Design a protein around this ligand. Structure first.
Ligand SMILES: CCCCCCCCCCCCCCCCCC(=O)OC[C@H](COP(=O)([O-])OCC(O)COP(=O)([O-])OC[C@@H](COC(=O)CCCCCCCCCCCCCCCCC)OC(=O)CCCCCCCCCCCCCCCCC)OC(=O)CCCCCCCCCCCCCCCCC
Ligand SMILES: CCCCCCCCCCCCCCCCCC(=O)OC[C@H](COP(=O)([O-])OCC(O)COP(=O)([O-])OC[C@@H](COC(=O)CCCCCCCCCCCCCCCCC)OC(=O)CCCCCCCCCCCCCCCCC)OC(=O)CCCCCCCCCCCCCCCCC
Ligand code: HEA
Ligand code: HEA
Ligand SMILES: CCCCCCCCCCCCCCCC(=O)O[C@H](COC(=O)CCCCCCC[C@@H](C)CCCCCCCCC)COP(=O)(O)O[C@H]1[C@H](O)[C@H](O)[C@@H](O)[C@@H](O)[C@@H]1O
Ligand SMILES: CCCCCCCC/C=C\CCCCCCCC(=O)OC[C@H](COP(=O)(O)OCCN)OC(=O)CCCCCCCCCCCCCCC
Ligand SMILES: CCCCCCCC/C=C\CCCCCCCC(=O)OC[C@H](COP(=O)(O)OCCN)OC(=O)CCCCCCCCCCCCCCC
Ligand SMILES: CC(C)=CCC/C(C)=C/CC/C(C)=C/CC/C(C)=C/CC/C(C)=C/CC/C(C)=C/CC/C(C)=C/CC1=C(C)C(=O)c2ccccc2C1=O
Ligand code: HEC
Ligand code: HEC
Ligand SMILES: [Ca+2]
Ligand SMILES: [Cu+2]
Ligand SMILES: [Cu+2]
Ligand SMILES: [Cu+2]
Ligand SMILES: [Cu+2]
Lengths: 139, 551, 285, 223, 55, 54, 74
């Protein structure tokens, strides 16, 4: 994945230039000096793109070329088993409902409702993560 | 000879859909549900806008109070921007991105459904502020710092608004993660990154923009909730709290508008070649323009802040002009695409041209707004209202309708009616221009935005009447589209071929209408950006490789 | 000349004159660009359609590299011209010459205004008044708020009339009691945000007008959402000749209201460009 | 002190004139008249945070305060001079009485609270809903002075208990009862909000029966 | 565990029953609430046949 | 049953989840007719859909 | 009576409800909503809500009955 890491490297470079230029341009010429608000966001945007691109580059340096990344390749190159994809699940809607219960508790500041919503969130995330690993009931 | 049915099955039997709705992990069904729920929220927000315009028709306060009108513009802006536009972006992504790259599914199929349900329930939580006796939030969708305090606006509608926005933002971030991973590492064997369509590029970069923007909004909203429920002093004016909130919110908010702008650029870039019978002009140029727009969208926010007197004007002015340039590159590429084609103006093409005109005038108004001296006069007026309505309506309405008329045959197997499409388009176009072309003049004369009431000596009466007439024309224009969709889901003309538009591209026109589960019973050899076109017209391949370069 | 401004009122200050010139030029340029692009769109839509006599698909061209380079260069020079004019006008508009003739301490509190007349120092050595009132300021330790002797409070049943001289360099210092408000006088062709704590948030709460060419009545409105009565916060500026202004200030030095002194100086006592808003919530109340 | 009245007038003119008319004469369809309400009324309505209000709806809700102690006292003195009415009780040191308002009879305070106060709040001042969007708030966050000025100058849909209807000693006893109810622990375990059988049924259904059904599912088989 | 760690019916806070006084949160145990709920929602329909009342 | 049970508790619901008590009463009055029908429709369709899944 | 193409396990349990019962129940419920308009209340927003819900219920009942009349629902 050379092109993916290249995109994130380009974004990281531009964001680093933007952050440094903003810090220098507001350290002088701004009322309070360094704005301390846009500068932080731009620096950590550089951090975000840097993390993603650097990880992708570690992935791509030790990766042999995939069919997707190799022009003039055949469809038969991609034969075999792709990975695992969940056919169905009703756990996402319960996770969303639990998060909504917790959010309603925090909006109206009802601590009992926040606690119940977090308990429901933990239970539903347990259900989602455990869904395809529960073995047969042993009796 | 073969045996067929005199008419395909209109609807499934009892119990065909509800369990799928509850438990689906199919990106196609998730996209369908996104589109339906987003259009319903659009109807609600438009009803709010109709109430606003009806109040603003005459110089008195005929039926709304000040508080109700404030709640109306606040919740209407919120619903239109966050509960319709970004989710419809993800709905289009779910519909066609896995198809466009030759993939059977999204990367994390349960996370997709989680994102959809987080959307639905967060939107409902934020809207539920109307059920409260005090009413919903009434501090604008921007929610500036001291007015959103516990003292100013003490009701629970603001809190419900904040937390529903947080839940919807979590859903949006998860959707962006899913889309980027799917684009990165699930493409077809022939689909190199420089062979994916423009829509896939735009969705990828839009998801990156989501990942940058939405977490900052979540942090700011958590800070504001701590402020309101704990007396935190995070946004106290004695600190830099006012301008701190403005900085954080706009660092979110301008990336948000480009989040809701780029994918519809991609949609029209898909639609133009199909009805022009020629390739997309400047494919790599369009990719570079998208990348430049996304990069510049993160470091332009404080041009929404020229009036505070607390920001560096030259930096953001220059950055705003510089971000305006690549969008002009995009329009010239689209013109080149339409240039010297065989244009047949079927409904998606008609909405694409409506997009071109509308967003053109919106961009002109925007570069007018970029200049701080001019924004000094026109900020917080209806010139701003007309500007962003023109851009938001060119992008998220005209291009959304073009995408719906385009991919409805692919998602349903039935064709929407062309006569109803033309009627609805012309109604929408005339109504939009009628209701928004005079708010420029309104704002320039001195009518500020977010006013619930004016006076007959102000001079704001005739233009407000014209705008209310246009708003009711726009409300009326939704009847043909709803009727068309409702009738043509079941009794629409069947599609029994791939590519009901003939000259399609992007690999979703190389599979049935609708596509089967797992999206593909075969994949053609991908050698160019438009594999389906060279799959259906092989004799053109040589020509596409000989005539591609004008110079 | 009169229709290209798209509603822009003719300014009453030189800064507003220059801003209106820039706006009209910018509208000209934007309409030119829009004309070009709309012409391309309608040229491609009117002609270039499908016809009955074509059976071969068009030339499949998707790259015109020199045209792309040219059409990328041109917007950069256009925005460069706009940026140059923008910076020149903006520096012309935020100047703050250090010797204003009159200083007004604009205070915006929730749904009314307060004009103070902090300092008046005519250039010609013909009038001088130090309204700075530190006693009440320290008695109100909201220390960022500025108090003056000759105040002008607006009420829910009275629109404050800011009386200014004509041709004298005026200064406005903007402060807010609780929330953000908007100082807009549409005739000034300029507005600013009245922030609670301007110095803590690093804001320019002070802005200056070189002179006001016209003696007249001008409406002003709040242009930042501030709560329920955000549309109910109008004020008026009455620019009178300097002699009538000095007479008004003398009538204010003796204990008298704003309307009393305005009538004493042969002016209408109330606001004439804007009547007060009925405090009634509506019509079906 | 007259400077107290002057600073109170300045505070009122930049924070209360809108909705109240610069002379405590009510602004129509925006707010009531403030003549005769009293410094006790001003103290309650400002220290509780309710004033200034930001909009008109079914009820003015409690907020964080907008004025410090001395600013509240100056506003109260201004309204009292321009008005004429009840005043906040003060102790020997001349400050608003806080600990010298708590009585020694909590059974009398409890009976008085149940006859007069618990109708609209809970048995322990947990709050109760009213007709159309209005409600009786929680008494947990209220110092003795705030309770005193509440029951002495009826804020909003709260009946006014005059100094004859509830003599200051009975008011002290009611204040003592409210404070003890707010500060007392629960003996039987975590008090489920003190609202009675509704949270108890919720706890039964979500903690007791959920546990029972989970245990049955563990013990038993499926299908 | 519930009888230890959760308070149910703390009757010292409610006080003895006097017919002249009442609290805001007057509710029965959950299994009876529907009864009271059915009393809350039914819309005050009464009949007065021939000098009598059917409440 | 659940609607009647929560209608019994509409005062506490309106005090905590800020709603007009009259609004809660009218929601209950409309609901004790509308909600049973919606629930019947949804449950019938859901059961048939479970059969189709099997 | 019903077949197993619409309800797969129609042989295993009670799986058909006569259409007349649901039509009559919908009309009766709309009538009840209408009746609740006359009462001891002074507000009238609830009157609009009652009328709207009765209107949507009657519209659904009439649509279903009409479609079953023309054979669009068999
Ligand atoms: C770009 C291309 C794509 C773009 C398209 C979008 C276009 C935008 C414009 C939109 C304007 C038009 C909108 C649609 C017009 C009509 C569509 C049409 O005619 O095609 C029908 C078409 C035919 O269905 P089928 O697959 O052939 O088989 C269904 C059988 O008819 C029998 O099915 P069944 O028996 O299993 O029942 C399913 C259905 C039964 O409902 C109905 O059939 C009619 C009643 C619902 C309409 C009333 C509004 C509510 O739903 C229900 O059961 C809900 C009960 C009634 C709702 C009450 C509240 C629920 C609690 O349905 C679809 O395929 C649509 C796919 C899903 C769309 C619905 C998305 C909304 C749901 C989101 C999540 C909510 C579910 C969770 C419950 C609530 C959680 C809190
Ligand atoms: C804001 C907070 C964000 C919430 C967390 C968002 C995680 C997003 C990660 C996406 C990338 C991986 C992924 O897609 O997960 C697969 C899966 C997506 O479903 P799919 O499309 O079918 O793909 C299946 C994969 O192929 C099959 O993937 P897999 O099963 O082989 O491995 C996926 C792995 C994923 O590995 C991770 O990413 C671990 C990172 C989770 C950190 C949790 C800290 C939460 C921060 C609190 C915020 C304050 O999950 C695990 O193995 C163990 C996860 C442990 C539970 C994580 C949540 C903890 C509960 C939070 C309760 C709050 C505490 C008190 C406050 O998502 C999950 O399994 C977990 C999502 C749970 C979301 C929680 C919503 C609240
Ligand atoms: C997604 C972008 C988007 C869209 C599509 C719209 C849609 C419309 N908007 Fe809005 N608007 C904003 C973005 C958008 N708006 C934003 C960001 C704000 C700022 C909010 C704030 O200040 O905080 C705003 C606020 C705003 C203002 C500023 C008001 C003020 O400040 O005083 C105005 C002015 O007229 C307006 C009008 C309209 C009109 C007439 C439409 C029309 O295009 C809508 C047409 C659709 C309809 C009219 C629906 C028809 C209704 C029916 C058919 C009824 C049936 C419905 C049901 C049965 C449920 N809206
Ligand atoms: C779809 C979302 C969207 C998009 C794409 C844009 C695009 C642009 N916007 Fe804006 N904007 C909003 C959504 C959007 N905006 C919203 C929602 C608000 C109000 C928020 C609120 O307050 O609630 C807003 C308000 C807003 C402000 C804040 C000012 C104020 O609040 O008063 C500014 C300031 O610069 C601005 C300018 C621009 C510019 C220069 C572009 C450029 O990207 C446009 C570039 C396009 C063109 C210029 C036309 C095509 C170009 C050519 C044909 C080439 C030739 C052109 C030249 C040579 C110049 N708009
Ligand atoms: C099973 C776990 C329970 C613990 C068991 C262990 C118990 C052992 C000893 C008990 C210790 C508690 C001491 C007794 C003291 C005590 O009771 O602890 C309360 C503390 O606070 C709170 O309640 C917030 C607590 C947050 C966690 C609560 C957990 C709730 C669980 C049970 C949720 C179940 C419900 C499910 C919801 C369903 C979801 C939707 C389906 C009182 O706070 P207080 O400081 O007095 O202020 C009051 C103010 O409520 C008031 O607003 C005001 O301030 C004052 O008037 C006062 O009343
Ligand atoms: C929301 C923002 C969350 C921030 C996390 C911070 C948690 C740790 C902060 C520690 C608190 C502290 O140490 O502050 C001392 C004060 C005493 O102040 P006092 O009484 O006036 O004086 C002393 C007299 N005794 O306690 C407090 O405010 C209690 C505040 C504790 C906040 C608990 C956060 C709950 C998490 C919310 C989850 C939201 C989920 C959203 C769902 C979508
Ligand atoms: C402006 C227009 C407004 C429209 C207003 C109302 C709609 C009018 C139609 C509304 C229909 C009113 C008349 C009607 O209900 O009769 C027919 C049904 C179906 O029979 P169908 O002949 O097979 O229908 C297919 C033809 N389509 O009910 C029956 O036959 C009776 C069946 C016996 C059931 C016994 C009743 C038990 C009561 C249960 C209470 C709960
Ligand atoms: C009848 C009606 C209209 C109710 C509306 C109330 C309501 C849900 C307001 C929230 C706004 C809305 C409608 C949001 C809709 C969006 C969505 C999907 C939200 C999902 C999250 C939801 C529904 C949260 C509410 C859950 C709910 C209503 C629970 C019942 C509430 C009750 C009575 C709990 C009982 C209870 C009370 C009252 C305590 O005080 C207490 C104190 C200490 C410990 C425990 C408790 C306790 O259990
Ligand atoms: C418009 C939103 C107002 C603002 C600004 C101020 N007040 Fe007000 N007042 C207003 C309303 C709608 C009400 C009735 C609701 C209530 O909570 O009482 C009031 C009432 C008062 C009272 C109590 C009246 C009594 O009988 O004792 C007081 C003491 C009061 N208001 C004082 C007050 C002060 C000090 C303000 C500036 C901080 C202020 N009000 C502003 C409306 C509005
Ligand atoms: C009618 C119902 C009553 C009755 C009979 C009592 N209270 Fe009050 N109460 C009620 C309302 C509607 C309000 C809010 C007033 C407003 O918002 O302006 C209050 C307020 C209080 C407060 C202040 C709450 C706080 O500090 O946040 C207190 C302390 C208080 N009420 C106590 C109280 C006492 C002791 C009563 C018996 C004498 C009493 N209330 C009766 C509603 C009502
Ligand atoms: Ca009107
Ligand atoms: Cu911006
Ligand atoms: Cu602004
Ligand atoms: Cu204001
Ligand atoms: Cu304002």
């Amino acid at each position: 994945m050379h092109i993916e890491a290249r995109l994130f490297e380009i974004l990281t470079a531009f964001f680093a230039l933007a952050a440094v230029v903003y810090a220098v341009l507001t350290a002088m010429f701004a009322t309070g000096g360094v704005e301390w608000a846009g500068t932080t966001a731009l620096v950590l945007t550089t951090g975000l793109t840097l993390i993603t691109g650097t990880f992708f580059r570690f992935v791509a340096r030790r990766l042999d070329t995939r069919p997707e990344d190799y022009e003039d390749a055949e469809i038969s190159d991609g034969a075999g088993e792709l990975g695992f994809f969940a056919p169905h699940s009703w756990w996402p809607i319960l996770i969303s409902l639990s998060f909504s219960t917790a959010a309603v508790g925090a909006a109206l500041w009802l601590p009992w409702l926040i606690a119940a919503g977090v308990a429901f969130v933990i239970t539903s995330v347990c259900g989602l993560v455990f869904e395809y690993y529960w073995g047969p009931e042993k009796h | 000879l073969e045996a067929r049915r005199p008419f395909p099955e209109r609807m499934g039997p009892k119990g065909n859909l509800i369990y799928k709705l509850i438990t689906t992990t199919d990106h196609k069904l998730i996209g369908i549900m996104y589109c339906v729920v987003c259009f319903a929220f659009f109807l609600v927000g438009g009803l709010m806008a109709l109430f606003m315009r009806t109040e603003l028709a005459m110089p008195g306060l005929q039926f709304l109070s000040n508080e109700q009108f404030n709640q109306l513009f606040t919740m209407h802006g919120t619903v239109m921007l966050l509960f319709y536009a970004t989710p419809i972006v993800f709905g289009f992504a779910n519909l066609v991105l896995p198809l466009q790259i030759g993939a059977p599914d999204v990367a994390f199929p349960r996370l997709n459904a989680l994102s959809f349900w987080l959307f639905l329930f967060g939107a409902l939580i934020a809207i539920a502020g109307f059920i409260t006796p005090g009413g919903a939030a009434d501090f604008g969708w921007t929610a500036y710092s001291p007015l959103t305090d516990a003292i100013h606006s003490p009701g629970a509608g603001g809190d419900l608004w904040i937390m529903g926005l947080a839940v919807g933002g979590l859903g949006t971030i998860l959707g962006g993660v899913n889309m980027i991973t799917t684009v990165v590492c699930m493409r077809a064997p022939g689909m190199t990154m420089f062979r994916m369509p423009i829509f896939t590029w735009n969705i990828l970069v839009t998801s990156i923009l989501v990942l940058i923007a939405f977490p900052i909004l979540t942090a700011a909203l958590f800070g504001l909730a701590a402020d309101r429920h704990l007396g935190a002093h995070i946004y106290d004016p004695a600190n830099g709290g006012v301008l701190l909130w403005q900085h954080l919110f706009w660092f979110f908010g301008h990336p948000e508008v480009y989040i809701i702008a780029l994918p519809f650029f991609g949609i029209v870039s898909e639609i133009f070649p199909v009805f022009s019978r020629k390739p997309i002009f400047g494919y790599t140029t369009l990719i570079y323009a998208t990348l430049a727009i996304a990069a510049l969208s993160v470091a332009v926010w404080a041009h929404h802040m020229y009036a505070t007197g607390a920001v560096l004007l030259p930096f953001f002015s220059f950055m705003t002009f510089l971000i305006a340039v690549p969008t002009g590159i995009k329009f010239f590429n689209w013109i080149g695409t339409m240039w010297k084609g065989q244009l047949t103006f079927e409904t998606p093409m008609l909405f694409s041209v409506g997009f071109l005109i509308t967003f053109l005038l919106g961009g002109l108004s925007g570069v007018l707004l970029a200049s701080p001296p001019l924004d000094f006069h026109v900020t917080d007026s209806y010139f701003v209202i007309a500007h962003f309505h023109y851009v938001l309506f060119g992008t998220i309405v005209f291009a959304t309708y073009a995408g719906i008329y385009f991919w409805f045959p692919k998602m349903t197997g039935r064709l929407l009616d062309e006569r109803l499409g033309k009627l609805h388009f012309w109604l929408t176009f005339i109504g939009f221009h009628t209701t928004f072309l005079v708010q420029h003049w309104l704002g320039d004369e001195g009518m500020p935005r977010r006013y619930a009431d004016y006076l007959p000596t102000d001079g704001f009466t005739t233009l407000n009447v014209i705008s209310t007439v246009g708003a009711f024309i726009l409300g009326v224009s939704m009847l043909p589209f709803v009727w068309n969709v409702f009738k043509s889901w079941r009794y629409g003309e069947p599609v029994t071929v791939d590519d009901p538009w003939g000259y399609g591209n992007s690999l979703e026109w190389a599979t049935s209408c609708p596509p089967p589960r797992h999206n593909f019973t075969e994949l053609p050899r991908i050698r160019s950006e438009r594999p389906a076109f060279e799959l259906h017209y092989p004799h053109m391949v040589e020509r596409m490789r000989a005539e591609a370069h004008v110079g | 000349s009169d229709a290209l401004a798209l509603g822009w009122p003719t300014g009453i200050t030189p800064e507003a004159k220059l801003n209106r010139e820039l706006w009209i030029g910018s509208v000209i340029a934007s309409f030119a660009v829009g004309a070009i692009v709309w012409g391309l769109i309608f040229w491609t839509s009117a002609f270039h359609r499908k016809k009955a006599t074509d059976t071969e698909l068009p030339r499949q061209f998707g790259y015109n590299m020199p045209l792309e380079l040219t059409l990328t260069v041109i917007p950069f020079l256009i925005i460069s011209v706009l940026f140059y004019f923008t910076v020149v006008v903006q520096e012309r508009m935020m100047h703050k010459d250090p010797n204003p003739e009159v200083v007004i301490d604009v205070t915006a509190f929730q749904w009314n205004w307060k004009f103070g007349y902090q300092k008046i120092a005519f250039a010609d050595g013909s009038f001088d008044y130090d309204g700075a009132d530190p006693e009440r300021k320290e008695a109100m330790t909201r220390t960022y708020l500025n108090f003056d002797k000759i105040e002008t409070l607006g009420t829910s049943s009275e629109i404050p009339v800011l009386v200014l001289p004509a041709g004298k360099r005026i200064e406005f210092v903007l402060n807010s009691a609780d929330v953000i408000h908007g100082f807009w006088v549409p005739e000034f062709l300029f507005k600013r945000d009245v922030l609670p704590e301007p110095k803590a948030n690093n804001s320019d709460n002070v802005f200056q007008v070189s002179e006001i060419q016209q003696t007249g009545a001008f409406v002003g409105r709040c242009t930042e959402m501030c709560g329920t009565f955000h549309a109910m916060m109008n004020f008026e500026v009455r620019v009178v000749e300097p002699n009538d202004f000095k007479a008004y200030i003398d009538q204010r030095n003796a204990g008298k209201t704003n309307a009393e002194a305005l009538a004493a100086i042969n002016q209408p006592p109330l606001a004439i460009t804007t009547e007060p808003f009925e405090s009634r919530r509506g019509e079906l109340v | 002190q007259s400077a107290l009245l002057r600073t109170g007038k300045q505070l009122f003119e930049t924070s209360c004139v809108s909705c109240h008319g610069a002379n405590l004469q009510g602004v129509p369809d925006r707010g009531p008249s403030l003549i005769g309400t009293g410094e006790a009324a001003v103290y309650f309505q400002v220290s509780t945070g309710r004033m200034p209000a930001m909009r008109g709806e079914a009820q003015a809700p409690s907020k964080p305060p907008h004025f410090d102690e001395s600013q509240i006292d100056a506003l109260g003195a201004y309204v009292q001079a321009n008005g004429g009415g009840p005043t906040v009780p003060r102790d020997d040191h001349g400050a608003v009485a806080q600990e010298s308002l708590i009585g020694g009879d909590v059974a009398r305070g409890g009976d008085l609270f149940r006859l007069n106060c618990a109708s609209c709040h809970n048995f322990t001042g947990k709050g109760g809903a009213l007709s159309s969007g209005k409600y009786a708030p929680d008494l947990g966050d209220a110092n003795p002075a705030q309770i005193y000025t509440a029951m002495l100058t009826g804020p909003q849909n709260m009946p006014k208990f005059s100094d004859r209807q509830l003599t200051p000693d009975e008011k002290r006893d009611i204040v003592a009862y409210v404070r003890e109810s707010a500060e007392t622990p629960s003996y039987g375990g975590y008090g489920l909000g003190g609202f009675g059988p509704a949270p108890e049924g919720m706890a039964m259904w979500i903690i007791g029966m959920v546990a029972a059904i989970g245990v049955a599912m563990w013990i038993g088989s499926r299908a | 565990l519930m009888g230890g760690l959760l308070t149910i019916n703390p009757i010292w806070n409610l006080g003895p029953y006097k017919p002249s006084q009442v609290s805001a949160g007057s509710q029965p145990d959950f299994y009876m609430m529907w009864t009271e709920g059915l009393a809350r929602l039914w819309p005050a329909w009464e009949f007065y046949p021939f000098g009598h009342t059917i409440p | 049953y659940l609607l009647l049970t929560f209608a019994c508790m509409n005062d506490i619901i309106a005090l905590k989840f800020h709603i007009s008590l009259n609004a809660t009463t009218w929601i209950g009055r409309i609901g004790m007719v509308v909600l049973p029908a919606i629930v019947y429709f949804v449950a019938y369709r859901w059961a048939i859909s479970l059969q189709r899944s099997d | 009576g019903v077949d197993v193409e619409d309800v797969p396990s129609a042989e295993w349990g009670w799986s058909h409800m006569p259409i007349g019962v649901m039509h009559i129940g919908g009309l009766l419920s709309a009538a009840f909503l209408l009746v609740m308009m006359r009462g001891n209340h002074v507000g009238h927003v609830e009157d609009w809500f009652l009328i709207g819900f009765a209107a949507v219920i009657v519209a659904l009942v009439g649509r279903n009955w009409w479609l079953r009349r023309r054979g669009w629902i068999r």
